[PDB]
Amino acid sequence: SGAIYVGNYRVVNRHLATHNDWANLVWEDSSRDLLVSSTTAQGCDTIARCDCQTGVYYCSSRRKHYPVSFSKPSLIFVEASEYYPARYQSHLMLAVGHSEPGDCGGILRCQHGVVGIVSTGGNGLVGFADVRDLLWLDEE
Ligand SMILES: NC(=O)[C@H]1CCCN(C(=O)C2(n3cccn3)CCCC2)C1
């Protein structure tokens, strides 16, 4: 689990969104595994606006932050699970790292701020849903 809190927005994995998230919905995209809801209190996270390919992510199943090299946001296959059928997930970045159930929502960050959240695992792979192109998170 985990979320990004920027301005009056809460960014979570779409597959982990609560009823309160859906009842206060700003935007959602199943192809990206992302959902944004509105918040009463202002958050402290800042979004990175960059093309970094190195950063650090939080792994809840290890209670550890790991430095990683990650790929550019792309259209990657995610093998069926109980959340989405076989398909292609967009705006996804992969790294070698550990990711196992209980781990989505962990933040990936670079020197500029938050880059995205854990969206995949298995295989000694970590997938992150990028948020750096969502410029509207910084305003209104
Ligand atoms: N983005 C998605 O489509 C993911 C939704 C949750 C399930 N997905 C995964 O990658 C699995 N996972 C690894 C670490 C955490 N979850 C792989 C093994 C079992 C579940 C796919």
Ligand SMILES: [Zn+2]
């Ligand atoms: Zn950066």
